[PDB]
Design an enzyme around this catalytic site. Structure first.
Site, short mmCIF file in Angstrom:
data_model
loop_
_atom_site.label_atom_id
_atom_site.label_comp_id
_atom_site.label_asym_id
_atom_site.label_seq_id
_atom_site.Cartn_x
_atom_site.Cartn_y
_atom_site.Cartn_z
N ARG A 39 0.81 -1.21 0.00
CA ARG A 39 0.00 0.00 0.00
C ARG A 39 0.85 1.27 0.00
NH1 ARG A 39 -3.68 2.90 4.50
NH2 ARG A 39 -5.26 3.82 3.12
N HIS A 43 0.64 4.42 -2.65
CA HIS A 43 0.45 5.81 -2.26
C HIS A 43 1.65 6.69 -2.57
CE1 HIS A 43 -3.25 5.53 0.66
NE2 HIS A 43 -3.53 5.17 -0.58
N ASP A 44 2.80 6.09 -2.88
CA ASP A 44 3.96 6.89 -3.24
C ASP A 44 3.85 7.25 -4.71
OD1 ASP A 44 6.39 8.14 -3.57
OD2 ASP A 44 7.55 6.29 -3.70
N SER A 53 8.53 10.15 -1.89
CA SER A 53 8.11 11.39 -1.22
C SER A 53 7.27 11.10 0.03
CB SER A 53 7.32 12.29 -2.19
OG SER A 53 6.09 11.71 -2.58
N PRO A 140 -7.32 8.22 -4.54
CA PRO A 140 -8.74 7.91 -4.71
C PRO A 140 -9.38 7.58 -3.36
CG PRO A 140 -7.45 6.01 -5.26
CD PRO A 140 -6.47 7.17 -5.11
N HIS A 171 -6.47 -5.64 -2.89
CA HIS A 171 -7.35 -5.85 -1.75
C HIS A 171 -7.63 -7.33 -1.54
CE1 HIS A 171 -9.06 -1.51 -2.00
NE2 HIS A 171 -7.90 -1.56 -1.44
N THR A 226 -9.60 -15.54 1.73
CA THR A 226 -8.20 -15.75 2.11
C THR A 226 -7.62 -14.38 2.49
OG1 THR A 226 -7.50 -15.60 -0.23
CG2 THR A 226 -7.82 -17.81 0.67
C1 HEM Z 1 -9.11 1.85 -6.43
C2 HEM Z 1 -8.93 2.80 -5.33
C3 HEM Z 1 -8.63 2.40 -4.02
C4 HEM Z 1 -9.30 2.81 -2.91
C5 HEM Z 1 -10.44 3.82 -2.87
C6 HEM Z 1 -8.61 2.24 -1.76
C7 HEM Z 1 -9.02 2.40 -0.43
C8 HEM Z 1 -8.47 1.73 0.66
C9 HEM Z 1 -8.97 1.81 2.03
C10 HEM Z 1 -10.23 2.50 2.52
C11 HEM Z 1 -8.15 1.08 2.79
C12 HEM Z 1 -8.29 1.01 4.31
C13 HEM Z 1 -7.31 1.89 5.07
C14 HEM Z 1 -7.60 1.90 6.56
O1 HEM Z 1 -8.73 1.57 6.95
O2 HEM Z 1 -6.68 2.23 7.34
C15 HEM Z 1 -7.18 0.44 1.93
C16 HEM Z 1 -6.20 -0.47 2.34
C17 HEM Z 1 -5.33 -1.16 1.49
N1 HEM Z 1 -5.26 -0.97 0.13
FE1 HEM Z 1 -6.47 0.17 -1.04
N2 HEM Z 1 -7.56 1.42 -2.16
C18 HEM Z 1 -7.49 1.60 -3.54
C19 HEM Z 1 -6.51 1.02 -4.35
C20 HEM Z 1 -5.48 0.19 -3.91
C21 HEM Z 1 -4.41 -0.28 -4.77
C22 HEM Z 1 -4.25 0.03 -6.26
C23 HEM Z 1 -3.57 -1.01 -4.00
C24 HEM Z 1 -2.34 -1.55 -4.36
C25 HEM Z 1 -2.13 -2.58 -5.35
C26 HEM Z 1 -4.14 -0.99 -2.66
C27 HEM Z 1 -3.69 -1.80 -1.59
C28 HEM Z 1 -4.21 -1.81 -0.30
C29 HEM Z 1 -3.77 -2.68 0.78
C30 HEM Z 1 -2.92 -3.95 0.63
C31 HEM Z 1 -4.43 -2.24 1.89
C32 HEM Z 1 -4.29 -2.78 3.31
C33 HEM Z 1 -3.13 -2.07 3.98
C34 HEM Z 1 -2.88 -2.55 5.41
O3 HEM Z 1 -3.58 -3.49 5.85
O4 HEM Z 1 -1.98 -1.99 6.07
N3 HEM Z 1 -5.30 -0.23 -2.61
N4 HEM Z 1 -7.41 0.82 0.60
O1 LIG Z 2 -6.42 4.36 0.62
C1 LIG Z 2 -6.92 5.44 0.15
N1 LIG Z 2 -6.59 5.86 -1.03
O2 LIG Z 2 -6.05 4.94 -1.97
C2 LIG Z 2 -7.90 6.17 0.98
C3 LIG Z 2 -8.34 5.62 2.23
C4 LIG Z 2 -9.24 6.36 3.02
C5 LIG Z 2 -9.68 7.61 2.59
C6 LIG Z 2 -9.19 8.18 1.44
C7 LIG Z 2 -8.39 7.44 0.56
CA LIG Z 3 5.48 10.04 -4.46
CA LIG Z 4 -6.78 -13.31 -0.72
#
Ligand code: HEM
Ligand SMILES: O=C(NO)c1ccccc1
Ligand SMILES: [Ca+2]
Ligand SMILES: [Ca+2]
Length: 308
Positions: A39, A43-44, A53, A140, A171, A226
Site C-alpha cells: 500500500r 500511495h507513493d 516522497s 482515490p 485488496h 483468504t
Molecule cells: C481503487 C482505489 C482504491 C481505494 C479507494 C482504496 C481504499 C483503501 C482503504 C479504505 C483502505 C483502508 C485503510 C484503513 O482503513 O486504514 C485500503 C487499504 C489497502 N489498500 Fe487500497 N484502495 C485503492 C486502491 C489500492 C491499490 C491500487 C492497492 C495496491 C495494489 C491498494 C492496496 C491496499 C492494501 C494492501 C491495503 C491494506 C493495507 C494494510 O492493511 O496496512 N489499494 N485501501
Molecule cells: O487508501 C486510500 N486511497 O487509496 C484512501 C483511504 C481512506 C480515505 C481516502 C483514501
Molecule cells: Ca510520491
Molecule cells: Ca486473498
C-alpha cells in the site's frame, strides 16, 4: 533514462535478498506488514510519481504526506522501511534509493504472500520534498463512483481498464477500518438504508464487526475468503456482492462497469491471467514520472533529505 531491472546487478546484487529477509522476519511478528508495504508503494507512486516522497517526515519547509487524508492514522510500516534501508546502506553505501527500495519491498511482499514473482524495473531516485496538497487530491477515496475511480487512475497515466481492475486486486489481503464502510452498513447515500449492492448475509456479519456505536478504528479483512493470501479470491467475492468497500463492489455492480465486469469474471476464474495482469499493471504504476539520472538524489535516511 529508462528504468531497468538490472540497475543494481553490479552495484548491489544482493539488495533483493536483503529486502526479502527483512520482510520475512517482520512477518513473524506482524502478518499484515506485507499488505501495508504494498500500500505504501501505491500511495507513493500516485503522488508525483514513485519518488519516495511519502517517506519524508515533516519539516519547516514542507508538510509530510503522512498527514494526508488516506494516510493519517492509516498508512504504516515506516520503521520496517528504515530497517531494510539501514541494512542496504551497510552492504552498499549510497547506492539504492528509497524509491527503488520501496518498489522492491512491494514486489517481495506480494511474492511472499503467495503472489507472482518478477523483477521490477529499477533506477528511480528520491525527491527533495513531500507533496501533501497533491496527495489529498490524487489519492482515490472509497466513496468514489466507478467513473471517478477511472479518472483518478487516468490522472496519473493509468488509462486502461485493466490497470484499475488489476491493481484493485491489491485488496486480496490487508485490513480496513470500520469507518470507511459505516455508510454502506446503515445509511448509504443519505437513504437511511444499507447499500443494496452488499450481500444481505454478509451485511449481518459486517454489522457485527462494525456496530453503529462501536469502535470506528476496528479492523476488518478485505478478503473474507483468504485474508492474508495474495490470490484471485478478491474477484470471486465481487461476483457474490461481497466487496468490502464501495470502490471494490463498483467494479462489478456499477452501471458503468460495462468494461470492467469482463475483467472481473476473467480474473476470478484464472489465477494466471490475474497474476500476469497484476504484474503488468504494477510495472506501469512503478513507471509514473520517476526521477532518474541526476534528478533527485539517493537518500541516506528515507525520512529526511540529504544535508549536502
Ligand atoms: C481503487 C482505489 C482504491 C481505494 C479507494 C482504496 C481504499 C483503501 C482503504 C479504505 C483502505 C483502508 C485503510 C484503513 O482503513 O486504514 C485500503 C487499504 C489497502 N489498500 Fe487500497 N484502495 C485503492 C486502491 C489500492 C491499490 C491500487 C492497492 C495496491 C495494489 C491498494 C492496496 C491496499 C492494501 C494492501 C491495503 C491494506 C493495507 C494494510 O492493511 O496496512 N489499494 N485501501
Ligand atoms: O487508501 C486510500 N486511497 O487509496 C484512501 C483511504 C481512506 C480515505 C481516502 C483514501
Ligand atoms: Ca510520491
Ligand atoms: Ca486473498
Amino acid at each position: 533514462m529508462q528504468l531497468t531491472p538490472t540497475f543494481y546487478d553490479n552495484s548491489c546484487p544482493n539488495v533483493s535478498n536483503i529486502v526479502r529477509d527483512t520482510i520475512v522476519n517482520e512477518l513473524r511478528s506482524d502478518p499484515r506488514i506485507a499488505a501495508s508495504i504494498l500500500r505504501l508503494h501505491f500511495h507513493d507512486c500516485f503522488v508525483n510519481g514513485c519518488d519516495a516522497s511519502i517517506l519524508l517526515d515533516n519539516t519547516t519547509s514542507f508538510r509530510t504526506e503522512k498527514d494526508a487524508f488516506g494516510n493519517a492514522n492509516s498508512a504504516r510500516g515506516f520503521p520496517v522501511i528504515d530497517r531494510m534501508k539501514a541494512a542496504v546502506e551497510s552492504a552498499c553505501p549510497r547506492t539504492v534509493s528509497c524509491a527503488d527500495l520501496l518498489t522492491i519491498a512491494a514486489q517481495q511482499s506480494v511474492t511472499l504472500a503467495g503472489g507472482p514473482s518478477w523483477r521490477v524495473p529499477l533506477g528511480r531516485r528520491d525527491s527533495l520534498q513531500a507533496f501533501l496538497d497533491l496527495a489529498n487530491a490524487n489519492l482515490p477515496a472509497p466513496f468514489f463512483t466507478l467513473p471517478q475511480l477511472k479518472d483518478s487512475f487516468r490522472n496519473v497515466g493509468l488509462n486502461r481498464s485493466s490497470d484499475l481492475v488489476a491493481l484493485s486486486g491489491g485488496h486480496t489481503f490487508g485490513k480496513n477500518q470500520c469507518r470507511s464502510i459505516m455508510d454502506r452498513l446503515y445509511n448509504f447515500s443519505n437513504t437511511g438504508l444499507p447499500d443494496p449492492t452488499l450481500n444481505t448475509t454478509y451485511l449481518q456479519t459486517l454489522r457485527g464487526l462494525c456496530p453503529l456505536n462501536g469502535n470506528l478504528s476496528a479492523l476488518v479483512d478485505f478478503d473474507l475468503r483468504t485474508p492474508t493470501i495474495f490470490d484471485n479470491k478478491y474477484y470471486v467475492n465481487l461476483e457474490e456482492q461481497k466487496g468490502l468497500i464501495q470502490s471494490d463492489q463498483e467494479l462489478f455492480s456499477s452501471p458503468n462497469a460495462t468494461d470492467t465486469i469482463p475483467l472481473v469474471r476473467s480474473f476470478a476464474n484464472s489465477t494466471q491471467t490475474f497474476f500476469n495482469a497484476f504484474v503488468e499493471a504494477m510495472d506501469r504504476m512503478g513507471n509514473i514520472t520517476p526521477l532518474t539520472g541526476t534528478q533527485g538524489q539517493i537518500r541516506l535516511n528515507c525520512r529526511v533529505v540529504n544535508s549536502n
